[PDB]
Amino acid sequence: MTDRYSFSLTTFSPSGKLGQIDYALTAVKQGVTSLGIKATNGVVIATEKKSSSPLAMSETLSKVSLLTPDIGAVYSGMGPDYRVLVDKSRKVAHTSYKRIYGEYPPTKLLVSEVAKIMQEATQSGGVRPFGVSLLIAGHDEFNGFSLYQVDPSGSYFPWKATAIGKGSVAAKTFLEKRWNDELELEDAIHIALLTLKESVEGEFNGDTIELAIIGDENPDLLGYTGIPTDKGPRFRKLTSQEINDRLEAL
């Protein structure tokens, strides 16, 4: 046995292209649309819960994931690749930061660690790149609210608002017209729902849409009292009912 694939499976072609990364991006293009919008007092990330079967319980499959109490993530592309990246992202947030500094990492640095893992799968021996693009929304004390995109190459860019996957070209155009620097969180959620409706074919409701926010601290979700400096997670996943309420004022 032994892993005898100690050589790179991603290489430069004569034209200077890294084929496997380009092909990974093509897989992301086929993936379901997801988006992120940044407001003054928060960030929103959203996507469609494309259920593979009506017998399948789509609540058990979480496309939007908590990484830290103040950082969340959504994707477009290959779901299994995303799932393992979330596991690694959650762990690296502890091993490479929290166990050293006694606090959760700022958004940009956690993104940087995730980006590193994806870059290594582009150069290390006997592996293919991750077939996903991530959108990571988060908050920290000194940088405030932020939104980042991470691609299969490991490259990451900060966005005011963006979309990835199936109908990203049209969705990004829609966001350019609506976005401004004076948006409140509720306005961003409203715009997120409008943008996402264009790329969805079938049912459009709280049960088929997954949406989470990075906003105010939630002391009710902390689970304990007695420490003033601990005020609760800024990450919150919106319920099916909470989404439907905002679809009436749509």
Partner: protein
């Protein structure tokens, strides 16, 4: 064209080895079905013993992973047993480390992660199997979670797997459209098994003897498989109404 031999991306962004592993899943030509009751989860599967020289007691695609978790496999038996042995080891290790029984959905995720690794690492091939895990979870209640060679997994109200999965799937879909509930409203597991067999008969359009079926049942704190005589009793009850 070596992008079709190992698990790397094709120009279309596809993994052909994963797709071909899905096709190996139907090599046995067996159909399986899983449904949830109030207090139970039932899984049934076709049993085919073509050779008379075979010992029919040893021919099985249902596995007792732990006391609480059962697993039915769609695919070749070597890969099925590979997956079964690993799931048993993982379930045992989980209990030792974390002090409680491994949940059905957590085991499904773990096995799905292992499958994901085979789709990303070149030296390991995907297993040509679909794994349907069943239990009565102490927190979530009756549970059905299914894993495939892509590393995908999800919970189910009910599910079906095999060559004629679509016929079974639609049959189940139409039932749950009428009842408007996420399970079989029935007290005893015996009647849930009868439902499962009845709807497989209707969907496939074939009658079954006691030796044509294989049944697994999950209740609170134990999973068990039915004998040929237990299934016979089940078939008699169906015929008498």
């Amino acid at each position: 064209g070596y992008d079709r031999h190992i698990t790397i991306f094709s120009p279309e962004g596809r993994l052909y080895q994963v797709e071909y592993a899905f096709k190996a899943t139907n090599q046995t030509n067996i159909n399986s079905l899983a449904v949830r009751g109030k207090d139970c989860t039932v899984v049934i599967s076709q049993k085919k013993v073509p050779d008379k020289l075979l010992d029919p007691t040893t021919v099985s695609y249902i596995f007792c992973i732990s006391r609480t978790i059962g697993m039915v496999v769609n695919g070749p038996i070597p890969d099925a047993r590979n997956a079964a042995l690993r799931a048993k080891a993982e379930a045992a290790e989980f209990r030792y480390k974390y002090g409680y029984d491994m949940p059905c959905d957590v085991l499904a995720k773990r096995m799905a992660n292992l499958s994901q690794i085979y789709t990303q690492r070149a030296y390991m091939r995907p297993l040509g199997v679909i794994l349907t895990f069943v239990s009565v979870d102490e927190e979530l209640g009756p549970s059905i979670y299914k894993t495939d060679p892509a590393g995908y997994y999800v919970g189910y109200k009910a599910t079906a797997t095999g060559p004629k999965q679509q016929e079974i799937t639609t049959n189940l879909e139409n039932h749950f459209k009428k009842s408007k509930i996420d399970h079989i409203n029935e007290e005893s597991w015996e009647k849930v098994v009868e439902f499962a067999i009845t709807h497989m008969i209707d969907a496939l359009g074939t009658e079954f003897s006691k030796n044509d079926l294989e049944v697994g049942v999950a209740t609170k704190d134990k999973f068990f498989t039915l004998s040929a005589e237990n299934i016979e009793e089940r078939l008699v009850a169906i015929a008498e109404q």
